[PDB]
Amino acid sequence: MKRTWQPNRRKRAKTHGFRARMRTPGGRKVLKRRRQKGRWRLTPAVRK
Amino acid sequence: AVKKFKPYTPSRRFMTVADFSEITKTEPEKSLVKPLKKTGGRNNQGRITVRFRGGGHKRLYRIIDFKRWDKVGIPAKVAAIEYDPNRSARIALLHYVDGEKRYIIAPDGLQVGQQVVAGPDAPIQVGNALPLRFIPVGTVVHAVELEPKKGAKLARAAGTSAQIQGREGDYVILRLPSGELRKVHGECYATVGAVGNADHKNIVLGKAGRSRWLGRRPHVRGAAMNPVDHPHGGGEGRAPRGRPPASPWGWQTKGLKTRKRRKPSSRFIIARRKK
RNA sequence: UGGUUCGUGGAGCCAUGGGGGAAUCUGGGCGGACCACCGCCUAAGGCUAAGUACUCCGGGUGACCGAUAGCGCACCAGUAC
RNA sequence: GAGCUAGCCCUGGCCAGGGUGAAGCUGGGGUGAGACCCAGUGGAGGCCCGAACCGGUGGGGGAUGCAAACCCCUCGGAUGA
RNA sequence: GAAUGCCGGCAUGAGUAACGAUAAAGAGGGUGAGAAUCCCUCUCGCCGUAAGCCCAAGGGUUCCUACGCAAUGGUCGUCAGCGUAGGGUUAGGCGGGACCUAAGGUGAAGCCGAAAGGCGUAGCCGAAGGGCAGCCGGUUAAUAUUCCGGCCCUUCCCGCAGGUGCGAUGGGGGGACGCUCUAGGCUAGGGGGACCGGAGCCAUGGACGAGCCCGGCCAGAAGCGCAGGGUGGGAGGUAGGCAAAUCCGCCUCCCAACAAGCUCUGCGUGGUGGGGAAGCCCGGGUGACAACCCCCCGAAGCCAGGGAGCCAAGAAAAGCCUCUAAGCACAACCUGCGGGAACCCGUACCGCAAACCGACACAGGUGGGCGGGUGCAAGAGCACUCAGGCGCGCGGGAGAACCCUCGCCAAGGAACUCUGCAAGUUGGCCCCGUAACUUCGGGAGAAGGGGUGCUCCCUGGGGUGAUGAGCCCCGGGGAGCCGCAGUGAACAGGCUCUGGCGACUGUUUACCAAAAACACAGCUCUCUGCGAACUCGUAAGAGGAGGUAUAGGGAGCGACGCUUGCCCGGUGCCGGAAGGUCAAGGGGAGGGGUGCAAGCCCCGAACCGAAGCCCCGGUGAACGGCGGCCGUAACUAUAACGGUCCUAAGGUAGCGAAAUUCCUUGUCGGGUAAGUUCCGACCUGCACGAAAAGCGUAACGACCGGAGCGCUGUCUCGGCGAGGGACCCGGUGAAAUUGAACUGGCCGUGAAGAUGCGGCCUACCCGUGGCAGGACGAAAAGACCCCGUGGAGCUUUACUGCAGCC
RNA sequence: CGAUGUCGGCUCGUCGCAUCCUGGGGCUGAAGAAGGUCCCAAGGGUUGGGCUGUUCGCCCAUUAAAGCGGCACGCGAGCUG
RNA sequence: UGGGAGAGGGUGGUGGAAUUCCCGGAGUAGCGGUGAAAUGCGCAGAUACCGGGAGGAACGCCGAUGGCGAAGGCAGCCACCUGGUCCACCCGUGACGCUGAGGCGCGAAAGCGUGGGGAGCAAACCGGAUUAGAUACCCGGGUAGUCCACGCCCUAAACG
RNA sequence: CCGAGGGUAGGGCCCGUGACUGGGGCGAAGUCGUAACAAGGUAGCUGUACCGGAAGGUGCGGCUGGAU
RNA sequence: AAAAAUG
RNA sequence: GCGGGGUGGAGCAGCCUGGUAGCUCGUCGGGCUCAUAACCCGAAGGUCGUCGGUUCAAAUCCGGCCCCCGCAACCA
Ligand SMILES: [Mg+2]
Ligand SMILES: [Mg+2]
Ligand SMILES: [Mg+2]
Ligand SMILES: [Mg+2]
Ligand SMILES: [Mg+2]
Ligand SMILES: [Mg+2]
Ligand SMILES: [Mg+2]
Ligand SMILES: [Mg+2]
Ligand SMILES: [Mg+2]
Ligand SMILES: [Mg+2]
Ligand SMILES: [Mg+2]
Ligand SMILES: [Mg+2]
Ligand SMILES: [Mg+2]
Ligand SMILES: [Mg+2]
Ligand SMILES: [Mg+2]
Ligand SMILES: [Mg+2]
Ligand SMILES: [Mg+2]
Ligand SMILES: [Mg+2]
Ligand SMILES: [Mg+2]
Ligand SMILES: [Mg+2]
Ligand SMILES: [Mg+2]
Ligand SMILES: [Mg+2]
Ligand SMILES: [Mg+2]
Ligand SMILES: [Mg+2]
Ligand SMILES: [Mg+2]
Ligand SMILES: [Mg+2]
Ligand SMILES: [Mg+2]
Ligand SMILES: [Mg+2]
Ligand SMILES: [Mg+2]
Ligand SMILES: [Mg+2]
Ligand SMILES: [Mg+2]
Ligand SMILES: [Mg+2]
Ligand SMILES: [Mg+2]
Ligand SMILES: [Mg+2]
Ligand SMILES: [Mg+2]
Ligand SMILES: [Mg+2]
Ligand SMILES: [Mg+2]
Ligand SMILES: [Mg+2]
Ligand SMILES: [Mg+2]
Ligand SMILES: [Mg+2]
Ligand SMILES: [Mg+2]
Ligand SMILES: [Mg+2]
Ligand SMILES: [Mg+2]
Ligand SMILES: [Mg+2]
Ligand SMILES: [Mg+2]
Ligand SMILES: [Mg+2]
Ligand SMILES: [Mg+2]
Ligand SMILES: [Mg+2]
Ligand SMILES: [Mg+2]
Ligand SMILES: [Mg+2]
Ligand SMILES: [Mg+2]
Ligand SMILES: [Mg+2]
Ligand SMILES: [Mg+2]
Ligand SMILES: [Mg+2]
Ligand SMILES: [Mg+2]
Ligand SMILES: [Mg+2]
Ligand SMILES: [Mg+2]
Ligand SMILES: [Mg+2]
Ligand SMILES: [Mg+2]
Ligand SMILES: [Mg+2]
Ligand SMILES: [Mg+2]
Ligand SMILES: [Mg+2]
Ligand SMILES: [Mg+2]
Ligand SMILES: [Mg+2]
Ligand SMILES: [Mg+2]
Ligand SMILES: [Mg+2]
Ligand SMILES: [Mg+2]
Ligand SMILES: [Mg+2]
Ligand SMILES: [Mg+2]
Ligand SMILES: [Mg+2]
Ligand SMILES: [Mg+2]
Ligand SMILES: [Mg+2]
Ligand SMILES: [Mg+2]
Ligand SMILES: [Mg+2]
Ligand SMILES: [Mg+2]
Ligand SMILES: [Mg+2]
Ligand SMILES: [Mg+2]
Ligand SMILES: [Mg+2]
Ligand SMILES: [Mg+2]
Ligand SMILES: [Mg+2]
Ligand SMILES: [Mg+2]
Ligand SMILES: [Mg+2]
Ligand SMILES: [Mg+2]
Ligand SMILES: [Mg+2]
Ligand SMILES: [Mg+2]
Ligand SMILES: [Mg+2]
Ligand SMILES: [Mg+2]
Ligand SMILES: [Mg+2]
Ligand SMILES: [Mg+2]
Ligand SMILES: [Mg+2]
Ligand SMILES: [Mg+2]
Ligand SMILES: [Mg+2]
Ligand SMILES: [Mg+2]
Ligand SMILES: [Mg+2]
Ligand SMILES: [Mg+2]
Ligand SMILES: [Mg+2]
Ligand SMILES: [Mg+2]
Ligand SMILES: [Mg+2]
Ligand SMILES: [Mg+2]
Ligand SMILES: [Mg+2]
Ligand SMILES: [Mg+2]
Ligand SMILES: [Mg+2]
Ligand SMILES: [Mg+2]
Ligand SMILES: [Mg+2]
Ligand SMILES: [Mg+2]
Ligand SMILES: [Mg+2]
Ligand SMILES: [Mg+2]
Ligand SMILES: [Mg+2]
Ligand SMILES: [Mg+2]
Ligand SMILES: [Mg+2]
Ligand SMILES: [Mg+2]
Ligand SMILES: [Mg+2]
Ligand SMILES: [Mg+2]
Ligand SMILES: [Mg+2]
Ligand SMILES: [Mg+2]
Ligand SMILES: [Mg+2]
Ligand SMILES: [Mg+2]
Ligand SMILES: [Mg+2]
Ligand SMILES: [Mg+2]
Ligand SMILES: [Mg+2]
Ligand SMILES: [Mg+2]
Ligand SMILES: [Mg+2]
Ligand SMILES: [Mg+2]
Ligand SMILES: [Mg+2]
Ligand SMILES: [Mg+2]
Ligand SMILES: [Mg+2]
Ligand SMILES: [Mg+2]
Ligand SMILES: [Mg+2]
Ligand SMILES: [Mg+2]
Ligand SMILES: [Mg+2]
Ligand SMILES: [Mg+2]
Ligand SMILES: [Mg+2]
Ligand SMILES: [Mg+2]
Ligand SMILES: [Mg+2]
Ligand SMILES: [Mg+2]
Ligand SMILES: [Mg+2]
Ligand SMILES: [Mg+2]
Ligand SMILES: [Mg+2]
Ligand SMILES: [Mg+2]
Ligand SMILES: [Mg+2]
Ligand SMILES: [Mg+2]
Ligand SMILES: [Mg+2]
Ligand SMILES: [Mg+2]
Ligand SMILES: [Mg+2]
Ligand SMILES: [Mg+2]
Ligand SMILES: [Mg+2]
Ligand SMILES: [Mg+2]
Ligand SMILES: [Mg+2]
Ligand SMILES: [Mg+2]
Ligand SMILES: [Mg+2]
Ligand SMILES: [Mg+2]
Ligand SMILES: [Mg+2]
Ligand SMILES: [Mg+2]
Ligand SMILES: [Mg+2]
Ligand SMILES: [Mg+2]
Ligand SMILES: [Mg+2]
Ligand SMILES: [Mg+2]
Ligand SMILES: [Mg+2]
Ligand SMILES: [Mg+2]
Ligand SMILES: [Mg+2]
Ligand SMILES: [Mg+2]
Ligand SMILES: [Mg+2]
Ligand SMILES: [Mg+2]
Ligand SMILES: [Mg+2]
Ligand SMILES: [Mg+2]
Ligand SMILES: [Mg+2]
Ligand SMILES: [Mg+2]
Ligand SMILES: [Mg+2]
Ligand SMILES: [Mg+2]
Ligand SMILES: [Mg+2]
Ligand SMILES: [Mg+2]
Ligand SMILES: [Mg+2]
Ligand SMILES: [Mg+2]
Ligand SMILES: [Mg+2]
Ligand SMILES: [Mg+2]
Ligand SMILES: [Mg+2]
Ligand SMILES: [Mg+2]
Ligand SMILES: [Mg+2]
Ligand SMILES: [Mg+2]
Ligand SMILES: [Mg+2]
Ligand SMILES: [Mg+2]
Ligand SMILES: [Mg+2]
Ligand SMILES: [Mg+2]
Ligand SMILES: [Mg+2]
Ligand SMILES: [Mg+2]
Ligand SMILES: [Mg+2]
Ligand SMILES: [Mg+2]
Ligand SMILES: [Mg+2]
Ligand SMILES: [Mg+2]
Ligand SMILES: [Mg+2]
Ligand SMILES: [Mg+2]
Ligand SMILES: [Mg+2]
Ligand SMILES: [Mg+2]
Ligand SMILES: [Mg+2]
Ligand SMILES: [Mg+2]
């Protein structure tokens, strides 16, 4: 049947994207948390 | 002159539709229409403020002139009468001798191809619009400005009308379609006569379909929901309300007066609505 | 109403949202309701180093661990997944 | 977090074939004029039968399954909410 | 040493289940250390509205080539979507961007909010919508509408010539639209052809034939022709389209009006350029100087912005056109010609799947287009089949039980069973014929019958054409032939009678309930006069609504028919300038602290003081409620009547052992050989009852009862047969569970149900296929039950608060 | 209670004797036939339907008889639900 | 042809009297009602009297033993549309007539459907009296209806 | 070919019958009331409508077959 | 301008 | 199992707070009538379900028994 994940490259980059992050004080903190942790990718990647 | 249908389908038994007799023109005037933004009962927040609305047929809003003191003393010929999906009343196209064209709500008995004009000296004749103070007492009138130069706010529904019961000072006394007696300022313009399509209330829908076509989604009773959703909800089997019948927010819905007490308009209301 | 040990207590003092609203030293605040006496201090403008706090960073030292312990990671780790 | 699900808004797309034959219209009859009747044309419908498509009624199988909801027979709606 | 402990490792089950569709395989010839699994050929089977082909999303080198097989592939492996290395994605015209806008988002102005931030006209972003100029053929191992070949086309710049008041983000026009049906004329595509082109073929009884088989096109500028779309022309006046305006709008006059013309498409033709088979020979070559024509069927597609009808009344902006303003008319625009310029990103491959979403090379899920031929009434249905693509990545044997799925059956035909669950019966089309009842449509395909194939003869009409032939499409009558059976295979309702419920099509518990629940039109109450009421939000702001009492919110009932009685004492709501009660506050009789005192400070009565509450009334389609005991009639029995206590008032109509009836299988009747269910009645209704509506109702229902016919493996009552498993051999090889084991029966005992203790009996050691009584067998720290001063959701006249309102 | 699946039916049985039949008897108010009551006896047998979820029971039609009970109200790692 | 009468019918418009309610003034111990009372109303200011307003219904005197129509039925006034009927003159057509099974239409009041309207009156209902009881006659309240529009029902002591 | 007739299916009319139920008819002498004939003690009747243990009461309109 | 049944 | 009740012939107050049983109908006697009912005037009748206890005294307060109503009987 239809599962949960139906990938969409536009939706992904607009929802979890970097520019989406910077627009909310929470999303800013999201980046700040990940940079301090040291993750290699602050945002899900997508090719566009 | 509502039409019926033979009952060839069980929903078509009772269905009735308007005769569309008075309608002369099948398509509106392109210059006077603009897109109607369908809200779906949802505000700017995105939350539903009015439940169970949306999904109706698409509509183009037709601009209406509710301020005929705009073009004083400039006559106009009734070009045509068209169907407006945005209100109960039919509307009439006006071809001003000025060349400008406008829609006004179509009063009953207005015949295509007749002069209409606005101004304190306009003849008392169906379709002409005057300030209230210059209109003979007792005449039928509609499209009443509630306050001066703010646009017609009263008696715009199909078949409605307002009567004049007397004057007092600058104000004149109207009998509104609700029966209320309201002092309205004399300088408030108003269009003489009664609103057309007075057979609107006898339209029997026929089936749930026409509730959706008009954009009215299904309305689900309270006692059918659950405690978390509504006061009447819950209860084993069917059950009465067991409490004063109350809205989904708790305020009682059986004869509870809600109008704000200290409202300044109270000074200008003579008699509460009838019946 | 808040702060102080002070939870309305005899409840001051400091601070203040509302109302009313002075004085320039013979002016004014405080010493726990309030009064008198006796004292202290001069509100409604501002700046001020040092003493104190922390450890991403560098070093030194351990009756600290020794690859299931010690940071999650001694190794290409916030990686694989 | 509304890329699953629920509701709405914007913009597009889809529904083989067949059956029934409302109103209206034209002709004729009818009457003082009408209502009305008859045949033709007409092609209405949350109409009918039935694929796609959308469903998931009954039964069986499957039960460490092909599958954390599937498969077979059967069955409902299918120009409309 | 234990914590259903944590990490890791290795066992047990077990060489057992399984190897992921039952569409299917065999042989031969290569290669290779090795082959059922790789490659080639012939034979066979499977899809063919796909299991074929092309796009879009998603995926990200999986495409091609070479060399490789440890691991990945449910076996094997030389093979591959795996490993290594090399190569591969070419655009002014396809798509997107340098154009436009919709939701929505963002947001100079402005508004709001303790901070963070929330709104918001314009503007801007935003596409699978609008706008926009390329078609055919070839070529690479792999790219192509991208390279190449031919024939076309757009924009930008400069130059020139011709024409004109040129000029815009400002005005106007246009762009510009729904649903159902639909004309005419084309095209795609399809069928036949004794006509044309063709390598061959003569089989096994016949056929040298008007034979067999193959093929008989594609694109194409100007011009031409057929078919359609669109648009009237001039003059005058003008106060409107937020300046101007010749434009647009409005008025008046004149000529024209199914036209014509002018303009735009579509198709046909068109210089020319390509393509072009079967077969045979080793992807290529011939076939070939290939031919390339006629008739018919014909679209949902094109002309298109066509036409008619209808109610629910059917996007915006730009490109394009016109109008004029500053400006400027040495210019600028338009047309034509010439030369010059034309950028970024995507192009591989998979793409109903082994490459996407499902942990897997997963029987599931995934939007758009093409989707051929014949026959069956038609069709995207069913069967077979072209092009094309596959036999689903373990096999080989055996022919037990048992399971799955499928086929058949004597006589009986629901005796099965909770129930005809299931499986039978019926089945498509034509024609005759068809009941109660009904809201006149219906019920109705009701029911119930008959026909159905092929051949010869005769004969009506339609389309094309021409009016005819040809081809095609509908029928009619007669005469006959074969079979058990003629929709000869596949797809394709069993029917009837009577109840309860709900009016109806519809909706839901994704993932055990599709219902009698929800919704629905329709009825009633009730709120709201506009900056509405209500809702969301602290607000600003929104929705309501660019709506205005024929409108909008809330509540209950739920088509329609006939109806909806009595009670306002209590609660709710509505009304009520009296009175009572009432906080802050005003007031300050009168007392207190202290100072020598002027004074300072505190307590503080009567009275004045809103809502609310008390109080007076109203109100049922507001919450709710609608009795007991006793006597009495010329047989008895029962009470039309009466007596009495009480209540605010005591249940009317209609219904009633019901979805409700305890006693209950109440009693009588029907149906049956027999009826705790079903139907009709009766009424002493434990405990129906009138908008949590009362009683009914034609039609509708995968709803739930009862009955009958038809037919059946449901059953008496089982039997045979087929295939996939189960079994055997080769390859690969899990699982939960598991204290350890050398694990028998009985009679007792034991924490009260023993392989383990006592006595007695029986019993050689170890397995394979089977059966499920035991190991209180596995699985889940019982979900019922209580326990915890454990938790959570919900209710109100429980307590105390807060929003909101007064 | 870190689980002992709970009615009934189907299938498959096995045991007990307080025997329903058949067999052997005593007594009888046993003439015969046919019964009544007790005694011995468990080898075999103990039907088919209607209604109800039923167990039980009633009813139809038969029968030599249409027995009562145990085995976790036998039996769900056998099924139905 | 020329004239007369009439509540004959249909539409529109219009006048005053009164009742009820609302507002204003003024006023105080009761009003209302019956055979007599009581329910009801009234100091929360009624009745009675004045002024103003809203709204519906019906048309006093004329008026009659009167008139009109086929019947049921029709009554303020103004206008418009229109039927029936009588007198006069003796002009015209020249038996063209009378009744009328079916058929069609009209048809008081009550009743019904959909909307409208709603002062007064008033079935059903509530209450007060009478009574053995009073589901009545009488008093206090009161909904359908009575009224307008359209569409049904078509009955009668529709009787002279 | 026609055809008595037999079989199946669906309809039409008539008669008999049925738990129960509806009123109706009569039946020397039951119960409860008194509506009508006198102005029947509320004039009577009537069409209709609502209600009531029952006759009947009331509402709208009509007749006199109503007395004074 | 009519209080009040029956045999 | 819990709750309420039993008193003239019928239906009910008195019971809560001990001392005195009352209301309507009915029954009887007598009036009006031709006669009945209606109506008027008088009158009669209850040892309080039963038994036991408390108390100076029990319809009355406390126990037991009988009967008549009424409510509950749930999770399985
Ligand atoms: Mg789907
Ligand atoms: Mg996942
Ligand atoms: Mg999706
Ligand atoms: Mg996308
Ligand atoms: Mg977002
Ligand atoms: Mg890095
Ligand atoms: Mg109209
Ligand atoms: Mg927004
Ligand atoms: Mg948002
Ligand atoms: Mg709407
Ligand atoms: Mg919620
Ligand atoms: Mg709640
Ligand atoms: Mg409730
Ligand atoms: Mg409920
Ligand atoms: Mg209930
Ligand atoms: Mg409120
Ligand atoms: Mg105002
Ligand atoms: Mg504090
Ligand atoms: Mg000092
Ligand atoms: Mg001082
Ligand atoms: Mg101090
Ligand atoms: Mg300072
Ligand atoms: Mg400092
Ligand atoms: Mg160490
Ligand atoms: Mg060391
Ligand atoms: Mg080590
Ligand atoms: Mg470590
Ligand atoms: Mg570190
Ligand atoms: Mg590193
Ligand atoms: Mg590091
Ligand atoms: Mg979504
Ligand atoms: Mg057809
Ligand atoms: Mg048909
Ligand atoms: Mg037509
Ligand atoms: Mg047709
Ligand atoms: Mg349909
Ligand atoms: Mg059909
Ligand atoms: Mg169907
Ligand atoms: Mg399709
Ligand atoms: Mg669903
Ligand atoms: Mg299923
Ligand atoms: Mg199943
Ligand atoms: Mg499952
Ligand atoms: Mg189907
Ligand atoms: Mg739709
Ligand atoms: Mg092993
Ligand atoms: Mg094993
Ligand atoms: Mg095995
Ligand atoms: Mg196996
Ligand atoms: Mg199969
Ligand atoms: Mg081989
Ligand atoms: Mg494929
Ligand atoms: Mg490959
Ligand atoms: Mg290779
Ligand atoms: Mg390998
Ligand atoms: Mg391998
Ligand atoms: Mg090019
Ligand atoms: Mg852009
Ligand atoms: Mg833009
Ligand atoms: Mg700003
Ligand atoms: Mg914003
Ligand atoms: Mg586009
Ligand atoms: Mg393009
Ligand atoms: Mg090509
Ligand atoms: Mg390729
Ligand atoms: Mg090229
Ligand atoms: Mg110009
Ligand atoms: Mg056509
Ligand atoms: Mg064809
Ligand atoms: Mg040749
Ligand atoms: Mg031969
Ligand atoms: Mg012109
Ligand atoms: Mg102008
Ligand atoms: Mg201008
Ligand atoms: Mg061509
Ligand atoms: Mg051409
Ligand atoms: Mg050659
Ligand atoms: Mg088109
Ligand atoms: Mg147009
Ligand atoms: Mg069109
Ligand atoms: Mg045209
Ligand atoms: Mg339509
Ligand atoms: Mg339109
Ligand atoms: Mg723009
Ligand atoms: Mg200038
Ligand atoms: Mg490509
Ligand atoms: Mg597809
Ligand atoms: Mg593939
Ligand atoms: Mg996959
Ligand atoms: Mg596979
Ligand atoms: Mg798959
Ligand atoms: Mg699909
Ligand atoms: Mg197709
Ligand atoms: Mg096709
Ligand atoms: Mg086909
Ligand atoms: Mg055939
Ligand atoms: Mg067919
Ligand atoms: Mg198929
Ligand atoms: Mg058989
Ligand atoms: Mg047979
Ligand atoms: Mg049979
Ligand atoms: Mg049967
Ligand atoms: Mg049985
Ligand atoms: Mg069942
Ligand atoms: Mg079945
Ligand atoms: Mg019948
Ligand atoms: Mg029919
Ligand atoms: Mg039927
Ligand atoms: Mg048939
Ligand atoms: Mg044949
Ligand atoms: Mg043709
Ligand atoms: Mg021909
Ligand atoms: Mg033969
Ligand atoms: Mg079939
Ligand atoms: Mg069928
Ligand atoms: Mg039948
Ligand atoms: Mg339903
Ligand atoms: Mg349905
Ligand atoms: Mg479910
Ligand atoms: Mg679930
Ligand atoms: Mg289901
Ligand atoms: Mg708020
Ligand atoms: Mg707003
Ligand atoms: Mg409303
Ligand atoms: Mg309901
Ligand atoms: Mg109902
Ligand atoms: Mg009621
Ligand atoms: Mg009340
Ligand atoms: Mg009250
Ligand atoms: Mg004070
Ligand atoms: Mg004070
Ligand atoms: Mg107060
Ligand atoms: Mg109550
Ligand atoms: Mg007796
Ligand atoms: Mg009633
Ligand atoms: Mg009653
Ligand atoms: Mg029964
Ligand atoms: Mg019987
Ligand atoms: Mg049953
Ligand atoms: Mg029954
Ligand atoms: Mg009984
Ligand atoms: Mg009920
Ligand atoms: Mg109710
Ligand atoms: Mg019913
Ligand atoms: Mg009916
Ligand atoms: Mg029914
Ligand atoms: Mg049934
Ligand atoms: Mg049944
Ligand atoms: Mg069988
Ligand atoms: Mg086999
Ligand atoms: Mg052993
Ligand atoms: Mg034992
Ligand atoms: Mg031992
Ligand atoms: Mg076992
Ligand atoms: Mg087994
Ligand atoms: Mg536990
Ligand atoms: Mg549970
Ligand atoms: Mg255990
Ligand atoms: Mg267990
Ligand atoms: Mg014995
Ligand atoms: Mg023995
Ligand atoms: Mg014996
Ligand atoms: Mg004897
Ligand atoms: Mg004998
Ligand atoms: Mg035996
Ligand atoms: Mg035995
Ligand atoms: Mg039976
Ligand atoms: Mg029983
Ligand atoms: Mg015997
Ligand atoms: Mg037991
Ligand atoms: Mg039992
Ligand atoms: Mg058992
Ligand atoms: Mg089980
Ligand atoms: Mg077991
Ligand atoms: Mg069950
Ligand atoms: Mg089941
Ligand atoms: Mg007369
Ligand atoms: Mg003559
Ligand atoms: Mg006549
Ligand atoms: Mg009437
Ligand atoms: Mg009416
Ligand atoms: Mg009255
Ligand atoms: Mg009438
Ligand atoms: Mg015959
Ligand atoms: Mg015959
Ligand atoms: Mg009488
Ligand atoms: Mg009455
Ligand atoms: Mg008597
Ligand atoms: Mg007594
Ligand atoms: Mg007492
Ligand atoms: Mg006494
Ligand atoms: Mg006496
Ligand atoms: Mg005593
Ligand atoms: Mg005493
Ligand atoms: Mg419970």
Author numbering:
A (entry chain 17): 1 to 48
B (entry chain 1D): 2 to 276
The authors write:
During protein synthesis, ribosomes discriminate chirality of amino acids and prevent incorporation of D-amino acids into nascent proteins by slowing down the rate of peptide bond formation. To provide structural insights into the poor reactivity of the D-aminoacyl-tRNAs in the peptide bond formation we determined the crystal structure of T. thermophilus 70S ribosomes in complex with hydrolysis-resistant analogs of aminoacyl-tRNAs. We used cytidyl-cytidyl-puromycin (CC-Pmn) as an L-aminoacyl-tRNA analog that carried L-methyl-tyrosine residue (L-mTyr) and adenyl-cytidyl-cytidyl-adenylyl-D-phenylalanine (ACCA-D-Phe) as a D-aminoacyl-tRNA analog that carried D-phenylalanine residue (D-Phe). Using either of these compounds as an A-site substrate, we determined their crystal structures in complex with the T. thermophilus 70S ribosomes carrying messenger RNA and tRNAifMet in the P site.
